[PDB]
Design a protein around this ligand. Sequence first.
Ligand SMILES: Oc1ccc(CN2CCOCC2)c2cccnc12
Ligand SMILES: *[C@@H]1O[C@H](CO)[C@@H](O)[C@H](O)[C@H]1NC(C)=O
Length: 281
Amino acid sequence: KTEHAEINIFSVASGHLYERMLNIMMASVMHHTNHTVKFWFIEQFLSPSFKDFIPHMAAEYGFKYEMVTYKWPHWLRQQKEKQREIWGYKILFLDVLFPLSLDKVIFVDADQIVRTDMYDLVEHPLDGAPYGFAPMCDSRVEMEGYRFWKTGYWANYLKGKPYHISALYVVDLQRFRELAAGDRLRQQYHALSADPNSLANLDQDLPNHMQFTIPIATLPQEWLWCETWCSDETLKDARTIDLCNNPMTKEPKLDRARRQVPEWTKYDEEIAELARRVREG
Ligand SMILES: Oc1ccc(CN2CCOCC2)c2cccnc12
Ligand SMILES: *[C@@H]1O[C@H](CO)[C@@H](O)[C@H](O)[C@H]1NC(C)=O
C-alpha cells in the first residue's frame, strides 16, 4: 500500500527454460492491465543473464521490480533437492521476503500465461483468509485416476474441502502477518518434514494441510486452468493458464505451450525481438 504498485507479483524460476517462460508470463500480465505492476524475484535461483535483462523488460513493458535475497534459517529443516528448496521459498517465507509496507502479493508460476487484469485478483474478497488459491479442477473426468487427493489419506483428511493448486495464489500480507501464518507454517513444516516421505508436493501440500487453522479463500475455478485437470470447455472462461505436468502423456513443456496457447509464440517472439533490439543497440 501507499507508494507501492497496484499489482505486486512474485515468482520463482530456476533454469534457462523456466526463465524463458518467466519473461513470457510477465509480458502476458502487462498486456492485460493498465494498473501499475511490480514484479518481485527470488534472486539466488536466477541466471546472471536473466538478472541483466530484467531492466530492459521493465523499461519496455513499463513495470517496476525488486530482487529479494533471503537466507534459509539455520534452525529450519533444509531441502537437499533444489526443486524442494525452491518450493520452500514459495510457501515458507511469505512474511519475511517482502517489506512490511507491502499489503498484498500474488504468486504466479513462471510457466503461466495470464489472460486477465491481475488487479481483479487484488480486489477479490478473501473473507478474512490470509491467502487464496484456486481448487484443482475435477472437470476432466478422464484424469480421475491421477487425482491423488480424491482417495486415501487426502480424501480422509480434507473432509470435503478442496485440494488447491499452488500455481497461483494471492496473499493478503497484512492479514498473513496479523495471523502469524508464516511462523506457524514454518513450525508445522519443520515438524512434518522429519518424515522424508511427507509433503511430497511441498508448496501445495503444506497450505492444503493447514487449511483448517490457516484459512484458504477458495478462488473461482476460472482463476487457474491446466489442461491436465481441466476440460477443454472451460478454457474460454480461464483467466490464467498453467502449463502443469500431465502424468498421462508426459508431453514436453514447449510442445504443451505452443499447442495449447495461441498467443504463446507471439509473446516468445516479442521478447526475442526485444533481446535482438538491445543486443544491437
Ligand atoms: O495433512 C497432510 C500433511 C502431509 C501429508 C504428507 N504425507 C505423506 C505420507 O506420509 C504422511 C504424510 C499428507 C498426505 C496426505 C494427506 N494429508 C497430508
Ligand atoms: C488500457 O487502456 C487503453 C486505453 O485507455 C484501453 O484501450 C484498454 O482497453 C485498457 N486495458 C485494460 C485492461 O484496462
